[PDB]
């Protein structure tokens, strides 16, 4: 359902927002162009601004 790989060490300033670096990949459901990809794992829900991350879904 549409995979990315983080590529920029994030920090979460948010409670919902999740803190993630390089390397982490996550399950997107919805692309939200509002300028906030929402995404969830492991049960966690983790979201961050579109700009930090690239679209690419890998295997």
């Given at each position: 359902?549409?995979?990315?790989?983080?590529?920029?060490?994030?920090?979460?300033?948010?409670?919902?927002?999740?803190?993630?670096?390089?390397?982490?990949?996550?399950?997107?459901?919805?692309?939200?162009?509002?300028?906030?990809?929402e995404?969830?794992?492991?049960?966690?829900?983790?979201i961050?601004?579109?700009?930090?991350?690239?679209?690419?879904?890998?295997?």
């Open positions: 359902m549409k995979a990315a790989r983080l590529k920029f060490d994030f920090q979460a300033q948010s409670p919902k927002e999740l803190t993630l670096q390089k390397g982490d990949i996550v399950y997107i459901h919805k692309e939200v162009d509002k300028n906030w990809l995404g969830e794992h492991h049960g966690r829900l983790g961050f601004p579109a700009n930090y991350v690239e679209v690419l879904p890998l295997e």
